Amino acid sequence: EPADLNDDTLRARAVAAARGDQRFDVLITGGTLVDVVTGELRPADIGIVGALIASVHEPASRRDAAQVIDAGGAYVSPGLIDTHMHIESSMITPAAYAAAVVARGVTTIVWDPHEFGNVHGVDGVRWAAKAIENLPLRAILLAPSCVPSAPGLERGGADFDAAILADLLSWPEIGGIAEIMNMRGVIERDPRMSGIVQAGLAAEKLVCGHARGLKNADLNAFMAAGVSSDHELVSGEDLMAKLRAGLTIELRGSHDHLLPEFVAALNTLGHLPQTVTLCTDDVFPDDLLQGGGLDDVVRRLVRYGLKPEWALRAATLNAAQRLGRSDLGLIAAGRRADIVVFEDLNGFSARHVLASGRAVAEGGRMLVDIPTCDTTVLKGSMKLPLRMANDFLVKSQGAKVRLATIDRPRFTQWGETEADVKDGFVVPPEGATMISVTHRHGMAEPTTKTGFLTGWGRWNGAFATTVSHDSHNLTVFGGNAGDMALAANAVIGTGGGMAVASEGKVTAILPLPLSGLVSDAPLEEVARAFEDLREAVGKVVEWQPPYLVFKACFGATLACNIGPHQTDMGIADVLTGKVMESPVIEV
Amino acid sequence: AEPADLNDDTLRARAVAAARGDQRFDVLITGGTLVDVVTGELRPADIGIVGALIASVHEPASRRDAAQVIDAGGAYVSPGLIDTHMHIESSMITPAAYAAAVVARGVTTIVWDPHEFGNVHGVDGVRWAAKAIENLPLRAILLAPSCVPSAPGLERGGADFDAAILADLLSWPEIGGIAEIMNMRGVIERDPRMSGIVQAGLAAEKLVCGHARGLKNADLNAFMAAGVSSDHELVSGEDLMAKLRAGLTIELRGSHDHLLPEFVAALNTLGHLPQTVTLCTDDVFPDDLLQGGGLDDVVRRLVRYGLKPEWALRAATLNAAQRLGRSDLGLIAAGRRADIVVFEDLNGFSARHVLASGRAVAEGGRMLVDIPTCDTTVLKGSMKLPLRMANDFLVKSQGAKVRLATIDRPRFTQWGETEADVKDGFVVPPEGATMISVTHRHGMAEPTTKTGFLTGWGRWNGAFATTVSHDSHNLTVFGGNAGDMALAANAVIGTGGGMAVASEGKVTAILPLPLSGLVSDAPLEEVARAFEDLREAVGKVVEWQPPYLVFKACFGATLACNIGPHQTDMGIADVLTGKVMESPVIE
Known part of the structure; x- marks a missing residue:
C-alpha cells in the first residue's frame, strides 16, 4: 500500500x-x-x-x-483520518475500536501504542502491529518515543534507547516517532532524545511532538531538532502561535471547552491553513460510545460553528498530505x-x-467480520502479591516527623508539614490524601511507595487504577490504608484495572485484564462500567473543577511533567533528576 | 543527499x-x-x-x-520560489545561464522536464540535463521525459523511449518522476507503450505529471484513474475549475498571459486559494526571461492582475513543496x-x-557566487542533413490540373481541397495559404523534405525556418515561396541549428542555435536581442492576424500528440485516423 x-x-x-x-x-x-x-x-x-x-x-x-x-x-x-491517538485510552482492543469508529466514518487512524509499549515494550508494539494487520481500519503505527517518560526517575515495563527506536522505525507498519513528550530533553540536546529524533530523520519518517507550554524560542528548538507537529493546544493564541511556527496542527477534541476558541480563531483567520488536521488523542469508553471517535471532532467543531467543509477538509485531505x-x-x-x-x-x-x-x-453497523487477535501475551500483567494495610503506611522512627508533601493537583509543587508517628508508622496528617505507587511489572522490587498529596479534598475511602501515564504501575489514592488495600487487591486479582473502595467495601470495578489498560468486553459493558466507577468515585470525594477532577487520578505519577510526582521509585522531580525515596525530611 | x-x-x-x-x-x-x-x-x-x-x-x-x-x-x-514545470530549453540558453537569470530573482528550485534535449539526444540528453544541474545554485529536480517521440509512427525525432527506458530514468536519484505525459489518447486507450510507462511511474513511487490539453468529463476521469495527477494545459477559467474539482494538482502557468485575468477571477470567485494550486512557467522565451523573466514573473503577473500576493506566494512555495514531497x-x-x-x-x-x-x-538582481558552467561537448553538431534547395520545397505530380487538401487553419486543425495548375511537372503552389515543410534532421531516417500547404496563415513574402519545433525538432520551414525557404533552411542548417527569416532573396535575421538546435551558448543579453530582432524580421514577411495566428504558432504546428492534421518529417499526420499522408496530392 x-x-x-x-x-x-x-x-x-x-x-x-x-x-x-x-x-x-x-x-x-x-x-x-x-x-x-x-x-x-x-x-x-x-x-x-x-x-x-x-x-x-x-x-x-x-x-x-x-x-x-x-x-x-x-x-x-x-473517510475521516485520525492523526493522533491511542486505542488503549478507551479500554478496549483494536478490534472493538474498529467496529466502533469504522461504523462512524473513520477509515484511517494514526495510533501511538505508547501505552501497550510501556507495559510490554516492543513486544507491546509487535502486538499492536499484529492486532491491526487485517482490520477494516487502516492503522498507521507510530514508535512510542519515551519509554519510560523519565529514565532513572521511574520503572515501567519497558525501556527504549535509540537502537530500539531505530529498529521500530525500520518497520513498514510504522510511519514515524510518536509524540515526544520529553521536551527538555529534545531542546537541551539529551543523548537519548537527540539520538531517537536522529533516528526519525535517518528514517525520513514522521517525527511527531507534544508541545505543552513550549513558547517562542523553546519552540523554535523543538522544531529545529526535527519534530514537526503538535496536538497540545491550550488557547486560540496557542493555535495561532504554533500555526505560525510551521507545525502540523493535530487539532484535538478531548478538551471540549477550547474548541470554540480554536473555531473563533480559524474563522477570524478567514481560511483553514493546510497544515491543520484532526485527532482524538485520548477518548474514554463512555465518550467513545456516546460521542464517537474522530467524527465527534468533526461534529463538535461544526456545532461550535466552523464550516463543515473546513472540518472535513482538515479531517481528510490535510490528514493525507501530512502522512504523505x-x-x-x-x-x-x-x-x-x-x-x-x-x-x-x-x-x-x-x-x-x-x-x-x-x-x-x-446504518451505523458493520457489515463485516472483524478479525479478533490473540490477547494472551497481554494477560498476567500484575506481577506482585496482594497488599496489606501496611504497604500503605510509612514506617518511620521519631515521635514526630517532618514531611515533604506533593502540593497541588496537576500544577504540582513541593510542600511540607509536621506529622505524628504512632507505632512504627506516620499518621496521615489532617488534609492530606495518599498516593501509593507500587511497581507492578516484575521488573523491580514490588515495593509500595507512599506520598502525601495536598489540594485533593478529603478521602472517604480509595481509588486504585493501574492506568497511570506513562509507566502504568499500580497507583492507589485515598484517605486510609484499609480502603486502600481493598481497591489494590481488587485490581490485582482481576489482572489490572480500576476499583473504587470505601468504608471497608469495594464499590465498583472496571476490570481491565489486558495490560492493566484495556478489556475484552464489548464497548457497552466497558462504558457502563466506567460511568459507574466515576459515579462511585464522585461519591468518595467531592471534586473541585477544573483541575481537582477525576481525570487527574490517571495523571499523577507522570514523571516527565514538571514538579514532584510520586513514582514507583519515590518522589520524582525531573529538573534535579533525583529520586526522593521517602517523604520524611528529619526527626 | x-x-x-x-x-x-x-x-x-x-x-x-x-x-x-x-x-x-x-x-x-x-x-x-x-x-x-x-x-x-x-x-x-x-x-x-x-x-x-x-x-x-x-x-x-x-x-x-x-x-x-x-x-x-x-x-x-x-x-524561495519553486517551478512546478518547465523547460530550460525554450529560453535558448544553458542551465547555468538560466540559474543565472532566476536565482537573482528568488527562484530557488525548478522542476525541469528536458524532453526537448530528450528528443534530440535520448538518454544521452537526459544524462546531460543531469550533469548540467549538479552544482547549480538553483535546485533542479528532473523528470522522465515521458513521450519521445510524442506520437510513435506518425513522426520521427532523435530518440524512442519505451517502458524499459522510462524505468531506467525513474531510478536515477536525480529524477522525481514522469514528465508531462502528453500522449493522452495513448493513456486513456491503454496503449501498451504508454500504459507500461505510466506503470513504470507508479512502481517508482514518484510523480506522474500530465498535460491534459482538452480532456473533459469522462476522458479526464480515465487519464486520472490511470494515475496521472497534475496538469498545466488550462484553456478557460472554467477549465481551471474542473481540473480543480477533478482533484488534479494544478501546475498554473504564466506562459499564456491572456488567460490570467480568467484564472484570477475564478479563484477570487471561490474565495480561497486551494492547496492543490502551484505555479509554473512551462516555456519562457529568452526575451521575457530577461524583461520578466522567470517564475517570480508568474507570482508578479498574477498579483498585478488581482491575486492577493499571499496566495500568489502560497502557491509559488508551500503548495509546490507539498506537491514535491x-x-x-x-x-x-x-x-x-x-x-x-x-x-x-x-x-x-x-x-x-x-x-x-x-x-x-x-x-539586488545580481549573482553573489560563481555558477559552474557545464561542459557542452555532447550537444554539438546535430544537423545531420545536406543543404536544401528551391526544389526540396516543391511537390511533384503526374497531372496538369490537381486535387489537394491541406491543414486548413493554424493552431487547432482541419482539412480542405483545391487545385494547383500543377506547372512544369511540379504542383504550382496555390493561393490562400502558406506551405510547411519538415525535414528529419537527426540522422534516423532519410532527410527527404516533406511539404505541406497550411492555410489561412497569412500571406508570406518569404520564410521562417526554425529547428526549435515541438517535439521532434526537425527542420520546419513555413514559406511563401521556394527560393527563400531554402535560403532560411540553409542558414540554420549551417549554424548547426537555430532560426532564420528570409525575404525576396535575402536572409534578414539569424539566430544561431549550435547546441542541439535548441539553445545557444551566448549570454542571454545576446540571445534575447537576437530573439526580439528575429520577431521583428518575421512580422515583415507576414502580417500576423492575432491571436490564433501569433509567432509562438510557428513552433507548435508540428506537435503530433494533439488532434487535427499536422505536417511532420513523414507527412500529414492524423492522431485519430492513426495514419499519415505520403504527399498531399490526389487527381
Whole structure:
C-alpha cells in the first residue's frame, strides 16, 4: 500500500471503467459531494473498480455497476483520518475500536501504542502491529518515543534507547516517532532524545511532538531538532502561535471547552491553513460510545460553528498530505475508495462507509467480520502479591516527623508539614490524601511507595487504577490504608484495572485484564462500567473543577511533567533528576 | 543527499543550540516582514539560520547573535520560489545561464522536464540535463521525459523511449518522476507503450505529471484513474475549475498571459486559494526571461492582475513543496531549508536578497557566487542533413490540373481541397495559404523534405525556418515561396541549428542555435536581442492576424500528440485516423 493500487490489471480495468467501456464494481449515486479541495458541496456520483475510485462524474449519467450504493438526500466525503491517538485510552482492543469508529466514518487512524509499549515494550508494539494487520481500519503505527517518560526517575515495563527506536522505525507498519513528550530533553540536546529524533530523520519518517507550554524560542528548538507537529493546544493564541511556527496542527477534541476558541480563531483567520488536521488523542469508553471517535471532532467543531467543509477538509485531505499518502483524504479519480456517506453536515450519521472499495458499514453497523487477535501475551500483567494495610503506611522512627508533601493537583509543587508517628508508622496528617505507587511489572522490587498529596479534598475511602501515564504501575489514592488495600487487591486479582473502595467495601470495578489498560468486553459493558466507577468515585470525594477532577487520578505519577510526582521509585522531580525515596525530611 | 544533508547530527545539534540561545547563528535576517505562508499573514519576524537550516523564527530585534546579518528593513521575507514545470530549453540558453537569470530573482528550485534535449539526444540528453544541474545554485529536480517521440509512427525525432527506458530514468536519484505525459489518447486507450510507462511511474513511487490539453468529463476521469495527477494545459477559467474539482494538482502557468485575468477571477470567485494550486512557467522565451523573466514573473503577473500576493506566494512555495514531497522546502519555519528571497515590496517582487541552502547567492538582481558552467561537448553538431534547395520545397505530380487538401487553419486543425495548375511537372503552389515543410534532421531516417500547404496563415513574402519545433525538432520551414525557404533552411542548417527569416532573396535575421538546435551558448543579453530582432524580421514577411495566428504558432504546428492534421518529417499526420499522408496530392 499504495502498491496494491498500482496493479496493472486493476489500473487497466478501472481506466476503461472510467472510459465507458466496462462497468464499475460500485457506483455511489444521487449524493452531494463535499469537494474538499474546492470546499463546494456539488452533485456527483462516484464509480469505483477495486480499491480505486474510477470516476467522479455527472449525476445519473451512468448506471453500469455490479452494485449500487445510494446517497440521494445525503453527502459524500473521503473517510475521516485520525492523526493522533491511542486505542488503549478507551479500554478496549483494536478490534472493538474498529467496529466502533469504522461504523462512524473513520477509515484511517494514526495510533501511538505508547501505552501497550510501556507495559510490554516492543513486544507491546509487535502486538499492536499484529492486532491491526487485517482490520477494516487502516492503522498507521507510530514508535512510542519515551519509554519510560523519565529514565532513572521511574520503572515501567519497558525501556527504549535509540537502537530500539531505530529498529521500530525500520518497520513498514510504522510511519514515524510518536509524540515526544520529553521536551527538555529534545531542546537541551539529551543523548537519548537527540539520538531517537536522529533516528526519525535517518528514517525520513514522521517525527511527531507534544508541545505543552513550549513558547517562542523553546519552540523554535523543538522544531529545529526535527519534530514537526503538535496536538497540545491550550488557547486560540496557542493555535495561532504554533500555526505560525510551521507545525502540523493535530487539532484535538478531548478538551471540549477550547474548541470554540480554536473555531473563533480559524474563522477570524478567514481560511483553514493546510497544515491543520484532526485527532482524538485520548477518548474514554463512555465518550467513545456516546460521542464517537474522530467524527465527534468533526461534529463538535461544526456545532461550535466552523464550516463543515473546513472540518472535513482538515479531517481528510490535510490528514493525507501530512502522512504523505496521495491515495487518501479526497474523492477523485485515481485515489482510494475510502468513503463515508453522511445523512447531513450536522450530526454526521454515516449512512454508508467504504474501505478500499468494499462497503463495510451501513446504518451505523458493520457489515463485516472483524478479525479478533490473540490477547494472551497481554494477560498476567500484575506481577506482585496482594497488599496489606501496611504497604500503605510509612514506617518511620521519631515521635514526630517532618514531611515533604506533593502540593497541588496537576500544577504540582513541593510542600511540607509536621506529622505524628504512632507505632512504627506516620499518621496521615489532617488534609492530606495518599498516593501509593507500587511497581507492578516484575521488573523491580514490588515495593509500595507512599506520598502525601495536598489540594485533593478529603478521602472517604480509595481509588486504585493501574492506568497511570506513562509507566502504568499500580497507583492507589485515598484517605486510609484499609480502603486502600481493598481497591489494590481488587485490581490485582482481576489482572489490572480500576476499583473504587470505601468504608471497608469495594464499590465498583472496571476490570481491565489486558495490560492493566484495556478489556475484552464489548464497548457497552466497558462504558457502563466506567460511568459507574466515576459515579462511585464522585461519591468518595467531592471534586473541585477544573483541575481537582477525576481525570487527574490517571495523571499523577507522570514523571516527565514538571514538579514532584510520586513514582514507583519515590518522589520524582525531573529538573534535579533525583529520586526522593521517602517523604520524611528529619526527626 | 537532500535532504539527509539537513539531518546530520553535528549540524542539527548546532542549530538547536543557536535556537536555544546558547550558540550564535551563521546568519540573521532582521527588520523584515515575514510573509507567513501558512496563516497567510504579513508579520514582523527575524530569522536565524545555521548551515542550511532555518534554525529560528523569532520576535524582531530579540537576537543580534550572528556571524553575518542580512538586512530586510522595509522589505518582505518570503520562502524561495519553486517551478512546478518547465523547460530550460525554450529560453535558448544553458542551465547555468538560466540559474543565472532566476536565482537573482528568488527562484530557488525548478522542476525541469528536458524532453526537448530528450528528443534530440535520448538518454544521452537526459544524462546531460543531469550533469548540467549538479552544482547549480538553483535546485533542479528532473523528470522522465515521458513521450519521445510524442506520437510513435506518425513522426520521427532523435530518440524512442519505451517502458524499459522510462524505468531506467525513474531510478536515477536525480529524477522525481514522469514528465508531462502528453500522449493522452495513448493513456486513456491503454496503449501498451504508454500504459507500461505510466506503470513504470507508479512502481517508482514518484510523480506522474500530465498535460491534459482538452480532456473533459469522462476522458479526464480515465487519464486520472490511470494515475496521472497534475496538469498545466488550462484553456478557460472554467477549465481551471474542473481540473480543480477533478482533484488534479494544478501546475498554473504564466506562459499564456491572456488567460490570467480568467484564472484570477475564478479563484477570487471561490474565495480561497486551494492547496492543490502551484505555479509554473512551462516555456519562457529568452526575451521575457530577461524583461520578466522567470517564475517570480508568474507570482508578479498574477498579483498585478488581482491575486492577493499571499496566495500568489502560497502557491509559488508551500503548495509546490507539498506537491514535491519536500517538507524541507517552501516555508520559513525552524526545521526547514533556508532557501529565502527577500522582496522589496509585493507589487514588483524585487529580490533584494536570495538565500540557497544557508548561503547567500544574490543581492539586488545580481549573482553573489560563481555558477559552474557545464561542459557542452555532447550537444554539438546535430544537423545531420545536406543543404536544401528551391526544389526540396516543391511537390511533384503526374497531372496538369490537381486535387489537394491541406491543414486548413493554424493552431487547432482541419482539412480542405483545391487545385494547383500543377506547372512544369511540379504542383504550382496555390493561393490562400502558406506551405510547411519538415525535414528529419537527426540522422534516423532519410532527410527527404516533406511539404505541406497550411492555410489561412497569412500571406508570406518569404520564410521562417526554425529547428526549435515541438517535439521532434526537425527542420520546419513555413514559406511563401521556394527560393527563400531554402535560403532560411540553409542558414540554420549551417549554424548547426537555430532560426532564420528570409525575404525576396535575402536572409534578414539569424539566430544561431549550435547546441542541439535548441539553445545557444551566448549570454542571454545576446540571445534575447537576437530573439526580439528575429520577431521583428518575421512580422515583415507576414502580417500576423492575432491571436490564433501569433509567432509562438510557428513552433507548435508540428506537435503530433494533439488532434487535427499536422505536417511532420513523414507527412500529414492524423492522431485519430492513426495514419499519415505520403504527399498531399490526389487527381
